[PDB]
Amino acid sequence: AAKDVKFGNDARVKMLRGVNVLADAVKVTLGPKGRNVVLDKSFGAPTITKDGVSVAREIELEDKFENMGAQMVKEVASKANDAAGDGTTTATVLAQAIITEGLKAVAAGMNPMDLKRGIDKAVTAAVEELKALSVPCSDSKAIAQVGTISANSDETVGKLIAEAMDKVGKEGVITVEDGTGLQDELDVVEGMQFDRGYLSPYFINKPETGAVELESPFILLADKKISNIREMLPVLEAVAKAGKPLLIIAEDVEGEALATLVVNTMRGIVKVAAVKAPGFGDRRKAMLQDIATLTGGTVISEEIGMELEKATLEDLGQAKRVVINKDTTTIIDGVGEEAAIQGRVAQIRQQIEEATSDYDREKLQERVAKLAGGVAVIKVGAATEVEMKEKKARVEAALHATRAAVEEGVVAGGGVALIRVASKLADLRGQNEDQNVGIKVALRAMEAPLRQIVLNCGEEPSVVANTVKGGDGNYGYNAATEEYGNMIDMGILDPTKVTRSALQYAASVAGLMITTECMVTDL
Amino acid sequence: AAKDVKFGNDARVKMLRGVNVLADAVKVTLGPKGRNVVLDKSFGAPTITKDGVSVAREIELEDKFENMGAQMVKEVASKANDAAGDGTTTATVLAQAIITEGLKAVAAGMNPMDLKRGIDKAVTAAVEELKALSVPCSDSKAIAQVGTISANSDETVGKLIAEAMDKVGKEGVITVEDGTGLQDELDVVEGMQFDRGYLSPYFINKPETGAVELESPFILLADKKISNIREMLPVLEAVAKAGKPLLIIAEDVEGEALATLVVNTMRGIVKVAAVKAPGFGDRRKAMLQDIATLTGGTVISEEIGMELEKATLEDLGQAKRVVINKDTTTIIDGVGEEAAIQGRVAQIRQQIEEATSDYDREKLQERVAKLAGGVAVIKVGAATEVEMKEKKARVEAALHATRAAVEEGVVAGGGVALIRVASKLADLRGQNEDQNVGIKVALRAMEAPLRQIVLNCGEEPSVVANTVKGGDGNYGYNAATEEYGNMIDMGILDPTKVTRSALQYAASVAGLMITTECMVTDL
Amino acid sequence: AAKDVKFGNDARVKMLRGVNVLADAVKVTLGPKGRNVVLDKSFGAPTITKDGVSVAREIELEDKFENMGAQMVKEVASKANDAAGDGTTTATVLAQAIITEGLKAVAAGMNPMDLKRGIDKAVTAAVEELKALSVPCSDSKAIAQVGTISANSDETVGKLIAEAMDKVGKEGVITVEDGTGLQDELDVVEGMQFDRGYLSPYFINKPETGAVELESPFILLADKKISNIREMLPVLEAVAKAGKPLLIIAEDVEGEALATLVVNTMRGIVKVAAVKAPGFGDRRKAMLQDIATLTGGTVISEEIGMELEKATLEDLGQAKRVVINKDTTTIIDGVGEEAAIQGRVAQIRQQIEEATSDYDREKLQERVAKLAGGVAVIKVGAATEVEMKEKKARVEAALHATRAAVEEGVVAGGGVALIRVASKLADLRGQNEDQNVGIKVALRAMEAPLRQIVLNCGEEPSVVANTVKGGDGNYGYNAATEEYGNMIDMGILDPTKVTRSALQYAASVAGLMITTECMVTDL
Numbered sequence A, B, C: 001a002a003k004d005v006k007f008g009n010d011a012r013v014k015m016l017r018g019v020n021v022l023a024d025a026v027k028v029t030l031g032p033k034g035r036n037v038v039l040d041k042s043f044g045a046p047t048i049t050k051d052g053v054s055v056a057r058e059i060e061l062e063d064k065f066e067n068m069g070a071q072m073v074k075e076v077a078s079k080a081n082d083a084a085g086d087g088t089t090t091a092t093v094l095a096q097a098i099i100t101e102g103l104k105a106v107a108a109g110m111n112p113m114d115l116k117r118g119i120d121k122a123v124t125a126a127v128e129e130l131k132a133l134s135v136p137c138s139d140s141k142a143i144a145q146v147g148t149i150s151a152n153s154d155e156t157v158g159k160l161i162a163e164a165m166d167k168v169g170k171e172g173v174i175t176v177e178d179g180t181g182l183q184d185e186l187d188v189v190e191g192m193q194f195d196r197g198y199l200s201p202y203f204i205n206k207p208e209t210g211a212v213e214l215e216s217p218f219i220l221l222a223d224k225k226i227s228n229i230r231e232m233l234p235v236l237e238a239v240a241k242a243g244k245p246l247l248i249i250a251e252d253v254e255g256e257a258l259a260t261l262v263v264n265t266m267r268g269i270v271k272v273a274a275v276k277a278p279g280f281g282d283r284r285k286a287m288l289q290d291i292a293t294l295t296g297g298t299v300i301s302e303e304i305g306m307e308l309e310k311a312t313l314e315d316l317g318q319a320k321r322v323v324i325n326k327d328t329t330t331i332i333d334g335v336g337e338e339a340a341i342q343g344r345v346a347q348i349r350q351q352i353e354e355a356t357s358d359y360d361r362e363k364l365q366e367r368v369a370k371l372a373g374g375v376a377v378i379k380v381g382a383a384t385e386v387e388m389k390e391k392k393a394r395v396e397a398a399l400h401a402t403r404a405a406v407e408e409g410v411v412a413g414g415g416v417a418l419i420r421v422a423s424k425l426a427d428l429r430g431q432n433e434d435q436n437v438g439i440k441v442a443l444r445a446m447e448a449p450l451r452q453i454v455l456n457c458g459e460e461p462s463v464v465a466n467t468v469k470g471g472d473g474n475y476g477y478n479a480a481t482e483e484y485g486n487m488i489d490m491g492i493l494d495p496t497k498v499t500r501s502a503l504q505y506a507a508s509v510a511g512l513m514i515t516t517e518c519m520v521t522d523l
């Protein structure tokens, strides 16, 4: 079953109360003045983390309708999180701001659909304007700063990510592991990364992220593509011994060879993942060799024409870790000696001398980049296990945000980017008055992030907001030092990606909420 | 179990209260001014859809008798929905209007049976009069408009359906799929559609609609009719490999061949559907070939006399999708090359030159139409999964209504058609006064839809109603612009089919409700 | 599920109340004036032990939030206990002191993060300063005193530990067993200890401490490394007879031999642990022989080149007890005669005469130390089983603390060390006022231990504190005699390790607690 059915105003006030409890609990957290949130545990000491996200996860309300409103806006943070891995609190205060004024306009008699249309138009133009302002990333200091800011005042994690990207760039892979010990640790181990993915998706390992991950696995470099089981038999058994995954790098991922791997790892003997030698055609064989040289068992190549059968137990290689993902196959560390690797480099280096053309030159540079690009490993600091798991989360998000920042650039942080955008949209209008109110609702909500940051400092939101709007460009308020200045020069940046995402998800959920004619729930 | 038994007036007031709660919740929704309904979910954010239907599904009342009244009238929307796929809200306000005045007349002492007879007579004549007024559909713009109107202000879905029907007409099949991505998408893939249905009803797949649906299935064109298992063995095994359905298009659906398909797909090996080559006799073989040319493996024909055995692995064909239904067998996309297809066209095109007669000419044109008629695919827009599933529903209904409109035409929308009909019946009378009151009850209820649309706009129902009744023809009120004008010229049309259905189901359930001498329910 | 969510001050007062109940219950206990705590049992008489730890284990509160605060600070004692095995009560009063003033500062409006930073800085410098003051241990009387003090006024246990360490030093192993009878017991049985650990981490026995323990096991000294099963067959069967564990001491722990032991003890026949002959290379064989001479079956050596097969049933040796751990393999008691042992000593003693060099001299001395170093066994006094199990705990902790004291020295007890450290940090400052308050909070809490000890005596904390701070160095208050004096001269010492640990864990948990923006718990 029997349902309770309402109609009219009574659903709106319920929703609003529910989003307010959630947003108010979450938004404090934001702003350096407030610090941490505690999250209760059934056993032992509570968790202390400054996660807006950590706070949101705990919010559930008694009133069924208020709880619905809270769970709905909670979707904002989660989507912003999944998409950018940062800015969930910012997204939550933007949503509350849009929902609050939007529902007030509805109560005033304004058309919900028009309000939503206006909000949408403002967000569409705001995003374009955000792209126009955003400017790209810089060297490791800037990367560290952005990372720190995106991790909420962990400058350590910020530096780590910046250094890791300085080593491998985007190209290498960057990974995060629990720390070997209680320090933030950043080290480049020989990542060779080449562009497959796995085959049968059924190779997916623990990483729910749609990847696979092997630790100290063995690496069969079938250089030729694998003809026979026979050729595999020796390596498959070496991998049969437990804890040693096997990674098959044959000329392409086979039928024959692949089919066997799928069946064997299907029966629990020798878990195993397969990927092609990189590229196509000729370069494929040359690349399959670069992997051999890196993982130490240098297989007599496909280029040579020698087979997997040629490939042997010597052929098998090994690395502390290998991941095969959306990106690639990435081998982290490698048996292959630097001697062999650096020697291989010298070879290809002459190839470029000999090579008549640019094409051969391009193809060679592609190989050196893959084989030398390497990989950067971020170990979250540790001791105790709780703090270690927490810092790991921050490093993960900070990395994600910084990566985005590097691609298309970051914008002034401290909520000033959205304020500059809002001021540029002062003349934006819609098809009618109600749509115009919706536009204004959105532009007003764009000041909320800066205002909450200031409020958390113990300062006056309107005064600081008024002063920032007074200047222009990167002029903003540094909440850490409580001084005005050039946000970029002070190193307070936000990846354009997280700002954009926070705004779009906030407007999206807000738009939905806005129109509720009738509500139905269990009695 | 022990029952509670009432009698007399007390059942009527209960029913009326129950239909009022349901109808009032539903009818707001209707009218552009009101927007969406929210439907609560046990997990996550509520659903926002503007579905009268969505609202009705949630309505259940505490008082057992009131709940009975609500569940009864709820049958109106569901039947109108099943029959026309649109107009459920319109049907619900017509029912409430008829039930309300009808029960009042009963309370006044009027004979229930006569009241029902009068209502029935008015509806019978009204439907005839509705047919007299209705006028047929037009080109893609009109189709888009009607579709939009039938989808409640989704002009996008309206355009899609209109374009899809412009491509294949009625003849081709039109289908709807979840969008590949988050856009309304409309594309014609080579539908060849021929008239069967499936040899065994036990071939129905998941589509509860009594159709079976295969994705990228293999197509055996047994041109000759299939003699042997032997001939099937090769194709059956190719289909044995999983995910590839098999579609058997042999000269007719067999015994021999059919029986095998029924047994094999019965054991989970090679799921499989069979249909005849189209038509009978000679044309059958020629048509079975058109399918071959379309699905790419051109089987040596029955016309030739070559067999299924002649037919091979080359013979097997393939298409992204095939549906076998009430309509036909429809192959969407096809392996068969345009080269082959267009060449086949040229052949038959000369056949028409050579052909002595009209008969041969007709038969040939039938084949080109089937092979060229093609098929239109409507992809509801996507991102996120919720909105995507919703828009898909709207496109489905809009399509259904527009299809009906194209067949026998549409009538002025905005509730004006029923108002014109009602005015034409002002002199209608029955066998007695009570029957006359029933007639008047029905004619009065016919104004309800226009009045509710206006009420939802925030305007005055009586004033607008009075003004529309004042003019005539397609003169009506445009609720979107709040201007009077020619409904047809403004593109506000309703398929005559949904209007007729809404009225008949409303009168039908209303008639039933009207007479309740005694009521029995569980204690 | 549903959660209750609070925010603001209300979490802090709850936490504080919870830590106060726990700390107040625990801190009495500390100080000689108060004696014991009773712990209720479901059956029989209550347990009487003076364990702060015993009291903490029983603390659970009704109010869910207060209980959380109690369980959180309870983590302080447990970690200090795991790390130093003493000073849990001291750690608890330091935590209460830091938490109390820290939360007061927060309520006053001070920045939690800065408060925590200040506390952390003070603790970091305090620990450095603690190292500067600490001074190393001395002969058995001093060891006894420190042990007694660390065991809370069991001078008996103190003497035992001191004597045990005087026998074997650190080098020998010291162990604790339930008393054979109701006395503090203390005896050196021939421990020969060398550094392995176990070949397989699946040899771990009852001892949860990550060790193995065998009673009267048989000792196979495979001097040569074990080639064959054949060689093992005789000894494996002798060990097959039950209750006699087998310890394999072959040239190294094998593959061949090791693999067999893992499989056999895996099937419940002959439980068995394997360890290498000590060292590498040549010295390995010589050392493997020292074990033979000690466990009585002197195996024809690896040095000789004779094999396990050479080794026989005579070869097998036996000892009341053997433990294989983090430290080593340690054989306690031995079949091997003193005749053989002392004779072996004479041999190696001449080796030193002959030996040309220092290297050979060093290697030989290493062997005599291992073979003669011996082992000290501490039997907690007994009758009745309850008291016996209790005294055993005290001896274990006292031993642990005294061992730490011997390594890097002890500091003045009675809480004076922390008071001296605090006075040396009077000018320590941070980045801002809030950080300065945090520093002061920590320095103030450092007086808490001495103040509680005095309070438990029935004296005035402020007066005694004031007087101790008045003097300097090891000047302190002897709570047993209620006289001031030189803490070291009076034998009141604390291992620097327990003092350091108590302070760090107290500050660590206190720091966490301090910042709670919001709290979430089950309804």
Ligand SMILES: Nc1ncnc2c1ncn2[C@@H]1O[C@H](COP(=O)(O)OP(=O)(O)OP(=O)(O)O)[C@@H](O)[C@H]1O
Binding pocket: A030, A031, A050, A051, A052, A053, A086, A087, A088, A089, A090, A091, A149, A150, A151, A152, A153, A412, A413, A414, A415, A449, A453, A477, A478, A479, A480, A481, A492, A493, A494
């Ligand atoms: N010194 C500073 N002055 C002003 N604003 C700052 C400063 N440091 C960081 N910020 C801003 O705070 C926001 C990022 O903090 P945080 O990561 O806590 O927010 P969030 O990402 O929304 O919350 P969460 O990380 O839990 O999702 C950004 O807009 C950032 O620019």
Ligand SMILES: Nc1ncnc2c1ncn2[C@@H]1O[C@H](COP(=O)(O)OP(=O)(O)OP(=O)(O)O)[C@@H](O)[C@H]1O
Binding pocket: B030, B031, B050, B051, B052, B053, B086, B087, B088, B089, B090, B091, B149, B150, B151, B152, B153, B412, B413, B414, B415, B449, B453, B477, B478, B479, B480, B481, B492, B493, B494
């Ligand atoms: N611009 C307009 N002016 C007047 N009436 C309009 C306008 N647009 C649509 N309508 C009318 O609204 C009705 C269709 O809307 P809707 O689909 O919401 O009603 P419904 O089909 O009864 O509800 P549901 O689709 O949930 O069953 C039609 O009678 C249509 O002509």
Ligand SMILES: Nc1ncnc2c1ncn2[C@@H]1O[C@H](COP(=O)(O)OP(=O)(O)OP(=O)(O)O)[C@@H](O)[C@H]1O
Binding pocket: C030, C031, C050, C051, C052, C053, C086, C087, C088, C089, C090, C091, C149, C150, C151, C152, C153, C412, C413, C414, C415, C449, C453, C477, C478, C479, C480, C481, C492, C493, C494
């Ligand atoms: N004669 C004494 N005068 C002053 N203080 C003393 C005296 N004897 C012991 N103490 C002090 O009491 C403390 C050790 O006692 P105790 O072991 O009870 O404390 P605890 O280790 O914190 O509690 P628990 O052992 O249950 O963890 C030390 O700081 C020690 O120096």
Ligand SMILES: [Mg+2]
Binding pocket: A086, A087, A088, A150, A151, A152
């Ligand atoms: Mg963040």
Ligand SMILES: [Mg+2]
Binding pocket: B086, B087, B088, B150, B151, B152
């Ligand atoms: Mg409709």
Ligand SMILES: [Mg+2]
Binding pocket: C086, C087, C088, C150, C151, C152
């Ligand atoms: Mg103690």
